[PDB]
């Protein structure tokens, strides 16, 4: 039926030099004496302080070059590990489909879109003086460098679903399913069937919607035939999905999406690695200072906004269509 995969080792992207870049502080605003014109009509004046300003701005150009190199390496790694959701149809044929080991620093981390990754380099000045007033053009340039270069521009972020354990999206009826489909295709493209599996609860499941999980080899269990599909975790009842999952849930990771806002959401947990996905109708208004794990996400036209007391967290969303993910799963089903 299926073909065979051989787990060749992952290629290595050019890693980010995660260090501590230090900038020397600006000079100390030296008091120029007014030139005392009797020694000015004859031809520490302004020339020495201007030459020292030019020296500091040369040094600031050098450290701006270094910071831009760090940001280029970071965006190169993030574009190697999270491609735009059209490239990953060409992935599952070549030697880079089941590539993300749990030892690599990207594992069970999913692309939601492109926004401002905060530049994991340090950018720490060694300002040690006790509020000595700085030079008004050197310190202005350093303050202009530490605020627009410390945030990388629109770069592929990560919805790390190894440490959230509940992805309860809210929003529209099918526009939330776009983002769910997008990062669930991102999940099933990069990681092995034996390293994670995927499960579904849905009322109208085999109807041109979520039926594209028909071909996913991650919906399997070991040693059960069930006619055509191996296990077919996609069902219509969440409790029947749980008893379908009860030997599988007691580490092979899991990703359980639910389509019903009602019909006992989160009746599986509350587990110890199983992370569930849910779509709810409407928001909580006064959630009690929400945890770093289990967040709230509302899908706008192109924004995936988080809940923090609106902290949009994605500037442009990644929205996969239905037949696109159908083609991803159809190319994926050949290999195992």
């Amino acid at each position: 039926s299926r073909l065979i995969f051989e787990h060749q080792r992952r290629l290595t992207p050019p890693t980010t030099r995660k260090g501590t870049i230090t900038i020397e502080p600006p000079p100390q605003l030296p008091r120029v004496v007014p030139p005392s014109l009797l020694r000015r009509v004859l031809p520490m004046r302004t020339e020495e302080v201007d030459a020292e300003r030019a020296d500091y701005l040369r040094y600031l150009s050098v450290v701006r070059d270094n910071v831009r190199a760090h940001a280029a390496e970071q965006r190169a790694a993030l574009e190697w590990s999270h491609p735009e959701p059209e490239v990953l149809a060409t992935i599952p044929g070549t030697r880079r489909q089941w590539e993300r080991d749990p030892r690599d620093r990207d594992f069970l981390v999913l692309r939601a879109g492109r926004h401002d990754v905060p530049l994991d380099a340090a950018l720490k000045v060694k300002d040690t003086a006790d509020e000595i007033d700085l030079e008004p053009v050197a310190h202005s340039a350093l303050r202009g460098l530490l605020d627009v270069q410390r945030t990388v521009r629109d770069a592929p972020t990560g919805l790390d679903v190894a440490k959230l354990a509940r992805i309860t999206v809210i929003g529209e009826a099918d526009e939330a399913r776009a983002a769910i489909r997008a990062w669930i295709a991102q999940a099933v493209t990069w990681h092995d069937p034996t390293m994670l599996g995927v499960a579904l609860a849905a009322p109208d499941l085999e109807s041109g919607d979520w039926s594209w999980l028909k071909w996913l080899p991650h919906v399997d269990v070991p040693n059960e035939a069930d006619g055509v599909g191996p296990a077919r975790y996609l069902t219509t009842s969440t409790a029947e999905l749980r008893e379908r999952l009860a030997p599988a849930l007691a580490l092979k990771h899991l990703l359980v999406v639910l389509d019903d806002p009602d019909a006992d959401p989160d009746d599986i947990a509350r587990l110890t690695g199983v992370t569930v996905i849910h779509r709810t109708t409407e928001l909580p208004n006064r959630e009690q200072y929400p945890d770093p794990e289990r967040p709230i996400l509302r899908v706008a036209d192109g924004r995936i906004e988080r809940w923090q007391v609106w902290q949009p967290c994605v500037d442009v969303a990644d929205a996969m269509s239905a037949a696109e993910a159908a083609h991803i799963a159809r190319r994926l089903s050949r290999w195992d």
């Binding site: 965006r75 059209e86 490239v87 060409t90 202009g144 627009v148 521009r153 696109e324 190319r331």
Partner: protein
């Protein structure tokens, strides 16, 4: 419901072109793996030649594919890669202005030297010819015979070294060649002086087009060769006789008409098959050259018939009929520059008539010449704004047949009108 196409993919070494039968009414992301498997990173997609690649949500019939079209595998054009943001305005001026090719180098100095040389030649000819015609002197022809011989031996000398300065010097060299062959046998401006000038111009153009390496210059040299032969013929006819009573203009109009209608036979007169992409280009240039003479001679006599005031109304008819004859052949010529010359013949006619009525000090039909030129630019604006009137695919077939017969009859009428205007039939 299948449709057969031929797909084109050139990424590895050369390119593969293969026929296939793609099933329609399917979005293209389903049949792209089939063609990608056949004729063979970044996700590819089918594309019409010269256009954006097809969006994968569309099918082959929602966007329009004909049975037999040529489709090329192109990458998805997705978007721009994160434009840079720098806030140091000095660094923002040194960084963002590098898309300038601003290196001075030993390659801009060559263009400067070539343009400086052509400027020297043209301004020396202008200075010396103005000195010769505003005074009476023999140092003007002296320095013109100096500079023209200098440009001819320079264009002949640097020929096999750069081949771009050679043809450019040879093109700009026929203005002092025209002056030096125009000033010999002095008289008072002469009737055979323009004969000698056109003979020198056509002779030098034949020398240079015989010695030219390739194209980009065969058009201008062939054009000036044919109009040099034409002005040589009419100046021989007006120099070896005494009849000049507006016999020059009608003869030049008929000569321009002959080299306009018989341009296909005349243009191929100058001419493994592997040097075909050279040859036809050369032949195409030769075509344009003769058609340029079909305007130029065709305007040069066309001014001389309406040169003085109170002239005969048959000349006034024959100049507008020559204009409509050379402007109604603007649909039979396939290329763009031939059509452009034949449409700009009327514009050149109005401008040359305006400068004629300025030189002759008339100032009353010169404003009418500006008015006719305003009519011409208004009909150009009408043909350009709403792009539906001047289109043969919206005009019906017997109507365009009747307009073609009108253009067939209109350029036969000027020949007996010339024959009666000169006095051949008034004997």
């Amino acid at each position: 419901p299948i449709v057969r196409v031929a797909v084109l993919a050139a990424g590895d070494d050369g390119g593969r072109l293969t026929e296939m039968a793609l099933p329609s009414e399917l979005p293209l992301r389903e049949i792209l793996p089939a063609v990608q498997r056949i004729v063979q990173p970044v996700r590819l997609s089918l594309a019409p030649i010269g256009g954006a690649p097809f969006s994968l949500d569309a099918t082959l019939d929602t966007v329009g594919v004909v049975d037999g079209d040529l489709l090329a595998l192109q990458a998805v054009p997705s978007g721009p890669p994160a434009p840079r943001i720098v806030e140091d305005i000095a660094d923002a001026a040194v960084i963002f202005s590098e898309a300038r090719r601003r290196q001075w180098g030993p390659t801009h100095i060559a263009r400067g030297a070539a343009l400086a040389l052509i400027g020297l030649i043209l301004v020396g000819t202008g200075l010396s010819v103005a000195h010769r015609v505003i005074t009476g002197d023999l140092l003007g022809q002296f320095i013109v015979s100096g500079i023209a011989l200098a440009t001819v031996i320079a264009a002949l000398a640097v020929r096999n070294r750069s081949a771009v300065l050679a043809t450019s010097l040879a093109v700009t060299a026929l203005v002092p060649v025209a002056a030096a062959f125009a000033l010999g046998v002095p008289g008072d401006f002469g009737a055979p002086n323009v004969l000698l000038a056109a003979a020198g111009v056509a002779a030098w153009s034949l020398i240079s087009m015989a010695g030219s390496p390739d194209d980009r210059g065969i058009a201008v040299f062939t054009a000036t060769a044919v109009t040099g032969v034409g002005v040589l013929l009419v100046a021989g006819a007006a120099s070896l006789w005494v009849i000049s009573s507006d016999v020059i203009g009608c003869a030049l109009v008929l000569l321009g008409l002959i080299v306009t209608v018989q341009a296909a036979q005349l243009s191929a007169m100058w001419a493994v098959l592997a040097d075909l992409p050279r040859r036809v280009r050369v032949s195409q240039a030769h075509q344009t050259g003769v058609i340029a003479a079909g305007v130029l001679l065709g305007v040069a006599g066309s001014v001389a018939l309406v040169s003085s005031a109170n002239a005969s109304p048959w000349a006034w008819y024959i100049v507008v009929a020559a204009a409509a004859g050379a402007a109604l052949r603007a649909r039979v010529w396939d290329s763009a520059a031939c059509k452009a010359w034949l449409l700009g013949h009327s514009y050149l006619l109005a401008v040359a008539l305006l400068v004629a009525f300025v030189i002759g000090d008339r100032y009353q039909a010169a404003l009418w010449a500006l008015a006719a030129l305003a009519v011409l630019v208004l009909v150009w604006i009408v043909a350009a704004l709403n792009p539906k009137i001047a289109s043969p695919d919206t005009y019906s077939l017997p109507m365009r047949r009747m307009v073609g017969f009108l253009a067939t009859g209109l350029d036969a009428s000027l020949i007996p009108v010339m024959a009666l205007l000169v006095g051949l039939f008034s004997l």
